[PDB]
Amino acid sequence: QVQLVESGGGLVQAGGSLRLSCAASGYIFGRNAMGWYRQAPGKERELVAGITRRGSITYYADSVKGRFTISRDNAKNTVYLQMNSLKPEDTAVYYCAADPASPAYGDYWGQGTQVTVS
Ligand SMILES: [Cl-]
């Protein structure tokens, strides 16, 4: 019933930009905590950017600071990841994850979307 759907991936040239979107149904992002994850070739999945529940503070992995921006659009119940100045090292499967509003083991996860930087 709860669905996170990602879009906005594909192939881009180094130096370009992409916007990832994460659209939820059966669930409202609200002020819940959420994050964007990525799994690069040969690597474990790692957290790239997130928003806290408490105080709605954005945070970023050092490797993306100053280049990526997370934003939340309550009217659209959609969270975005704006990726600027993309590097080949950014190539990966990107995932969004959101905290459920009530008690639960586990988050809600999108399906993942491929971002390839040439
Ligand atoms: Cl928090």
DSSP string, 60-114: E-GGGTTTEEEEEETTTTEEEEEE-S--GGG-EEEEEEE--SS--SS-EE---EE
Residue tagged 């992002």 (tokens): 29
* Number of domains comprising the chain: 1
- How remote is the CA of residue 50 from the centroid of ligand 1, in Å? 10
Q: What single-letter DSSP state applies at residue 54?
A: G
Resolution in A: 2.0
User: What's the CA-to-centroid distance between 57 and ligand 1, angstroms?
Assistant: 8
| Method by which the coordinates were obtained | X-ray
Parent domain of 64? 3-115
How many whole angstroms from 19 Cα to the centroid of ligand 1?
A: 24
Alpha carbons 9 and 1: distance in angstroms, whole number = 24
- Residue 43 maps to which CATH number? 2.60.40.10
Ligand 1 geometric centre to CA of 42 (Å): 30
**Cα 54 to middle of ligand 1, angstroms:** 4
